[PDB]
Amino acid sequence: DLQCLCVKTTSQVRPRHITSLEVIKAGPHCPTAQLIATLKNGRKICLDLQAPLYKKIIKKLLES
Amino acid sequence: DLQCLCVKTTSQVRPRHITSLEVIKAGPHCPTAQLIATLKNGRKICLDLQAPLYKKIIKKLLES
Amino acid sequence: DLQCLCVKTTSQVRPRHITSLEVIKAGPHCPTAQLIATLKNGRKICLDLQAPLYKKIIKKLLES
Amino acid sequence: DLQCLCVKTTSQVRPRHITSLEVIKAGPHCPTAQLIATLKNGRKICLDLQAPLYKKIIKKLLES
C-alpha cells in the first residue's frame, strides 16, 4: 500500500534558492503529480501545482 | 507552520526496492527528521521514524 | 567532491515511460543544468538541456 | 547516466553541520554506495563508507 508524499504545499519560496526540482507522475500512491523542490540549504518542500510559480522556477534552472 | 513534507509516514516498504534514502535533519522547518525513501520505480515515500526500519533499510543500502 | 551525474545524452526517449524527471541547477557539482528521467524500468537516462523532449515530458508528467 | 557523484570523498566534517545525508546504493552508475552530505550552507561533501564517521553522523541526525 503506501501514500502521497505531497499534500502540504507552499508558495513562499525564493526561486533564487532551489537546487533541484523533481516532478513525479501521478499514479497508484497518489492521484496527482507531485512537484518536490529541494531548497538549497538541505530541506525540501512540495510546490503548488495550481500556483503560477513553477513556471518561473524551471526557466531559471534550465538557464545554464 | 509545518511543510514537513512527510506528514503521513509508513512502514509498508519492501526493503529491497529502495534505491536511495535521504535522512533530512529536523529544524525550524519541521520538528522532526524525515526518512524520505526513493524507490526503484521513481515513487518517493516518507518512512517512519525511530524504528529498526532505519537500520534495516540502511544496511541493505550500505552494500548492494 | 562530486562530478556531473550525466555522462552522455539521450535523444530517443518515449515521453510516457518516465516517472520522475529531476532538474538540477548548474553549480559546483557540474557547470551544466541536468535532466534525469527515471523510466518505468528503474533505468535513469539524462536528456539534452535544449531538447524538445522535456517540453512534452513536463506536461505529460503534470497532467493526470 | 553512468556517473558516480562522488569523485573524491571528504574525510572530516562536523556532525553538527550536515542537514540532509543521502545514502545511495549501488547499481549501474557507481558500483559503490555513496553517502552524500549537504552541509548547513549549501555545498555537498561525500562522506565515505568503511569508516568511523558515518555511523556517528546518522546518529546525530536521527535524534534531532
Curated annotation (Swiss-Prot), chains A, B, C, D:
Disulfide partners: C4-C30, C6-C46
Positions with a binding annotation for heparin: K55, K56, I57, I58, K59, K60, L61
Modified residues annotated as Phosphoserine in this record: S20
Top-rank taxon: Eukaryota
UniProt-recorded name of the protein: Platelet factor 4
UniProt organism field: Homo sapiens (Human)
